[PDB]
Amino acid sequence: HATYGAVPLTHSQVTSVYATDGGKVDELGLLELVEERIFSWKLNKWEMRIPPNLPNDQKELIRQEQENLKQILSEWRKCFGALNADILQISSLTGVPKDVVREKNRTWLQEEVAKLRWMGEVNKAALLRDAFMRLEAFGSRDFMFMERLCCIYGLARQGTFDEAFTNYITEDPVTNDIFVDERNPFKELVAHIVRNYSQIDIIYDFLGFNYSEGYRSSLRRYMEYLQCKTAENVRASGRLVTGDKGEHNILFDYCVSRESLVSGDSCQGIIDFLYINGNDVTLIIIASDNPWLRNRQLPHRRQMEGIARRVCFVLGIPPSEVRIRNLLLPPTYLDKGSIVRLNDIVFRLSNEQSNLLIPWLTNYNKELDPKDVDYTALAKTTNEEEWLTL
């Protein structure tokens, strides 16, 4: 539990504390074992996990992050229970073994449903068909795999969940020897996550798990990493990243728009990042949680023309081929379509070369939340706009 002197960890101390050497670590087996240990808990195991000697705002943000981890793990618990119930129902209605259900086919489903309908059991045939239909979308062993890995990385990030996975009294299944196990599969799994997934903090912040600082610094590190693999000759001074090829490849970290947006002020246009790629200019803006501030956060057409004219003045690029385009990002997370549009527009990367440069992009399945409709309307009116030519 929480002790006097426990502290929340950043990525550096998670990397340093869980730095062990492992060879051929099973991701799915240790993932299922750690989640089986998690699902066997009660709600009282989640109570005393906040470290006491902290200010109240930091304790509130830690409580919000732990509540988010708890509700996402409970959602995956009920999803896994539904998965096991559907697999057991299919193996009981059909008569096939349980381990070969996941490798079955749709022709096999048609044959088994026709066999059940021939015997006169239309209810069991409808149950088998509906269980297989809701099993084709959820039945993979790696379904929410990046989200579950980010949940376990967040449980390591809290710092108070590391001793909750060991010192259990178990029985041997074949000899019935009551013993106490000191093996910690959570530490081995977090060590393998830190060793293999070098950008697990970027996926952790992009999925909306970080409640303290958000995903903006992870976005800057992601864009700097994607600039270092495309320009390949990169100098980085403070908040300015530049390629030295003569062709303009510039990333400028202007300001943080969460503190820059004064509530009750009349100032049109506050951006976060400015990316100059060749002749193109992108104003990368992270939207705010205030819907009365999103209309003030995007710059005017005259302001974008002034920024493009300043680019023509400073970089010496002629104003015949100069294009400037706004880019709006979701406030608390970063969905898959936003990252795809960021790779398409800013860095001029298609899907195949982005999957070659970034391996974890294919299994990233974050989408826009349905309850935020005004942001989706603003992003539809913003991202479908033509490049403003000076």
Partner: protein, 406 residues
Amino acid sequence: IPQEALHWLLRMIVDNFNPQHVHYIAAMKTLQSAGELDMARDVWKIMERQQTWPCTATICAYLDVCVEAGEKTWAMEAWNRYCTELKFLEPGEVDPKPISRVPFSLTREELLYLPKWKKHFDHDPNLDVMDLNRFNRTREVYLRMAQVMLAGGERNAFQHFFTKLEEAMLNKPTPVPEPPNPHLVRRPRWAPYEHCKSVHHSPWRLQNNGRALALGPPVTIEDEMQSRFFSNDQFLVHSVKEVLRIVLQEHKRAHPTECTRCKTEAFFYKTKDADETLKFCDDLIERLFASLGVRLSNLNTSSLLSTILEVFRVVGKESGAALLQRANEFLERKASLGDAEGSRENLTASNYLQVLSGFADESAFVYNTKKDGTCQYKTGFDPRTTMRHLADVVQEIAGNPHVTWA
């Protein structure tokens, strides 16, 4: 009746009060003192169904009834639910924890905008669990989990728990003991009316007064402190004593016909599992003497010697003179490991009580057997030798004025 100890807890929840941890502790201890172990487990299930996370004192009070009932499954369930994250004290950590939870208060804003269920404070026992685990009673947990695995018959889990407890009591500092709580009673500050009958108020007998004990004690006391006030080596001695006491308890449970006063022929002779039991006890005593070096000269081993004599009297059928010889050899071994000329201690009243009960177990008999009026004795029983060994021992106890008879 003892069932009322279960009743007044239940009426505590029917009348919409939150039972604190002291109520569960008092209910489990009152039902354990009356021999109602299932009612104590019902109190534990009541605490679990109220979704109250127990403190270490409630955990120890549950593990006492898990130890006395000999049920390892209950203790393993309680371990895997609550005690998997209990750590021993470290030299770097502070010995008392500071109070983390500020008492509940509302500002001038939170009185208005918060709803009435957020501004409501009942004495919820889950709020002060981090402040009731302030004094690090983990050594009382790892001892209790060492005992119940001895009761269920698990040697490897007992060896793991006892090895962890031994390494913690040899290489980690002693925690600060929790002070007693005087706010749990509503006793008056003084006697409101001063009036005291004399000891000789009755001309027919000597009666006890409220001022002084004039009739003498009926039962000998051990005259030792509580287990929380002990040091780490003293708690290791107490741990060996408790493991031997649970060995004695499980031997009396497995063989109830051969452990009481006679009532049958089988009391006189050893059981067939007594040699391995005494071998395990001797190996535990030699492990205690090998772990602690000269420091065992500066520790109180009165209850340890009394439990050693009770084990080598009940489990091993030994004579009272053999028990006196073993106690004298134990005290001379303790006085000899100090590497000085020293001066040996005397046997206490609890140590002499085991020798006298061994003398009574030598001369014990089966009264009114099948021959209608013939008491059956032990084979090879000599009344003259046993009486001669009793009389000089009684004179030895009476020569020492520091042993209080009972």
